[PDB]
């Protein structure tokens, strides 16, 4: 029937979450001890909501945790600078927050937080976390709007230097749906490199997010974007709507890039399960 | 005044060949021995469709690849979905299109209208490293009904290094006269970042480059930075506000310009004449 | 908080006189003073509609230009040595800029006026497209506002310059100063060889034309990080410390190896009593 949409925030959440080491020199953020992935675990707010995280750093090494486009006080920060980052084996309650727009008494309209954000490292290795973000800590944010529409799955694509999440070259990661799905997608980059993202057989509106308003909104609609370290972005596409069925590409269109792997598939299924030719 | 785009609908039809061309370049073209680079400029109008019955004339594997359009995964055009064209082989790419509208969910459906370009998927690697460096690629144009239209229209496309695959100090150079209502498509790839700049004018950053109304909050901009497979266009009024002259345009990153990214925009008096060349 | 002042209507005409000087260090930058000259240049900014007439000096051993953005300017203000607009060495001249209001257009179409966040800078200096004179410092902001547009209590100009802020030593700043509650207003220029990533601890914008939402149907975008390449220029307004609180934010490009090596500034906002909490 009728699309699902966001209902209004306001409510104070709480969360645990864990910094810990993974294979290979690799560092992730998790929900629970050895839960820990790369990237993080999706965190989503209803604009109007407080969230309390409450943190342990289980390395060896000082960490923090720094977010983008939410509202947090200094002592939220993440940084060295500010004594926000978290001592080997400690504890920190970091505050995000989050408020809804509205007329400031100047007459402005005041922007709202929702958004497609993201939180990563801002210390392990330097003090802009050049070793922490390159090591996989960072993850997904997601602020809706009360009236938003709501997916039917959420997946996150991060660029983090020559890498899609950390992953070897040429191994995805995938994602699958059924033709008609309504599938989210948080598209991150990370590290020293400029990307362009592009997927086949669907496009997104260059605009909070990634659809169009209306027949007013004249944001430009597009299958390829550009973009650069701590950039982040989402929309919503319905799965193989006026193309069809297919396992469809995603990649960074930089040329070399593509070449040396970095590629996934949108993998979309008939009701029934095949994909043709595959 | 102002033409404007009618109603799409329409099932239409052309043919394309891929061929070599000199000195190991490669392009698309609307009759064998007539492909060019960029390649033919496709105009299409929301709703239409277009059966594409493409030749592939080289010794190689070519395939034709397209952003933003209705394409089933057979026309995806390429080797993983086994869409691209064997040595001397034939295929119909089939396109369609799409206007906006409500969908059952009650959400808005957003239309295929919109700068879109088209390049080679297979040739030297699997995303068509080397065919697009040899330079097969071409504009797109998709238009919604009621869309302003040009007088002309010209492709831009930051290739690499190259501005149209064209030596360095070439150009191209496009002449218009003072008021021409002109469109220019601005397409980038390779491996290079650019920002594209134009001299004297400016245009929307949106849907048609241009402010819908006093509502329209796009920001209005001379530069744009722009990656490999962008796609933006927009039209100016030639010389609007600024006078004849030879208005400048180029990559502004320095050392791209130092290199010889650069062209003319050439607008002329009623009588012909430029000032200043 | 009281209501916002606003940018009135222009249509004056108005004049200045610019210099371009030799700095300490191999710099180039322009001045309204003779051994005034800054970089980043001094901000201009105009009202829809208004024309400005610079009286141009240069003082230099070559020959340098005026080239800007956006705004409206016949062939012989381009700037260009090909249009012949460049300034020999001890020579002067008149560079005149337009800017208009937005309108319709005879033929039904809407013409976008002339405001925004633009730049000016040399296009003659080491190179036909100015490398050298951009690279030595030569490059100011220039502000078009629109009839209504909402007025800050301060500007700052962030020039990502190659490597260097405003063409500082690394880890130099500049560092700006507000008290919670100031609008405060960035205008963020781009030049050189390299992309960068904007980056702003604790606050937002819109990426649209004043870098604020217009109102509930504007759908641009709210971000604290966004790319820019060379040339690009765009601005936005923050209440400083508007739901975060007194601190000092970082602003820094987010391109890692630029931040390790130093591109990073602080927005230094004070509480009423002028404290920075933990600085
Ligand atoms: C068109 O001439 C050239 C272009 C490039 C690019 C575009 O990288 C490199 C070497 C050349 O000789
Ligand atoms: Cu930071
Ligand atoms: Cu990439
Ligand atoms: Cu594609
Ligand atoms: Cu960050
Ligand atoms: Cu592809
Ligand atoms: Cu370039
Ligand atoms: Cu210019
Ligand atoms: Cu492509
Ligand atoms: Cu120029
Ligand atoms: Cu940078
Ligand atoms: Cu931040
Ligand atoms: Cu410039």
Redesign the interface.
């Known amino acids: 029937?009728?699309?699902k949409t966001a209902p209004a925030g306001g409510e104070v959440k709480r969360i645990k979450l864990y910094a810990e080491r993974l294979g290979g020199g690799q560092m992730g953020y998790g929900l629970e001890k050895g839960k820990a992935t790369i990237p993080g675990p999706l965190i989503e707010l209803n604009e109007g909501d407080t969230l309390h995280i409450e943190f342990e750093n289980t390395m060896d090494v000082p960490v923090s945790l720094?977010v983008?486009?939410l509202?947090?006080?200094?002592?939220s920060?993440g940084?060295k600078?500010?004594?926000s980052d978290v001592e080997p084996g400690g504890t920190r309650t970091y505050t995000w927050?989050t408020?809804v727009?509205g007329r400031?008494?100047?007459?402005?309209?005041?922007?709202?937080?929702?958004?497609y954000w993201h939180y990563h490292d801002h210390v392990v290795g330097?003090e802009?976390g050049?070793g922490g973000?390159?090591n996989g800590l960072y993850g997904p944010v997601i602020v809706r709007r009360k009236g938003d529409?709501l997916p039917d799955r959420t997946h996150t694509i991060v660029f983090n230097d020559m890498t899609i999440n950390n992953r070897p070259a040429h191994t995805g990661p995938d994602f699958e749906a059924t033709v008609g799905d309504?599938v989210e997608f948080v598209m991150i980059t990370?590290?020293?490199y400029?990307?362009?993202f592009?997927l086949?057989?669907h496009?997104?509106?260059?605009?909070?997010?990634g659809?169009?308003?209306?027949?007013?909104?004249?944001?430009?609609?597009?299958?390829?974007?550009?973009?650069?370290?701590?950039?982040?972005?989402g929309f919503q596409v319905?799965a193989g709507?006026?193309?069809?069925?297919?396992?469809?590409?995603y990649?960074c269109?930089?040329?070399?890039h593509?070449?040396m792997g970095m590629v996934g598939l949108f993998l979309v299924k008939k009701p029934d399960g095949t994909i043709?030719?595959y």
């Open positions: 029937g009728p699309a720094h983008h486009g509202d947090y006080e200094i002592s920060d940084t600078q500010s004594r927050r408020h727009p400031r008494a100047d007459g402005t309209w005041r922007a709202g937080s929702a958004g330097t802009h050049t973000i390159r529409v309504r990370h590290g020293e400029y990307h362009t592009h086949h057989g496009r997104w509106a260059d605009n909070r997010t659809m169009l308003t209306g027949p007013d909104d004249p944001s430009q609609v597009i299958d390829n974007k550009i973009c650069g370290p701590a950039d982040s972005f319905i709507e006026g193309v069809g069925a297919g396992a469809w590409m990649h269109h930089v040329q070399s593509s070449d043709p030719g």
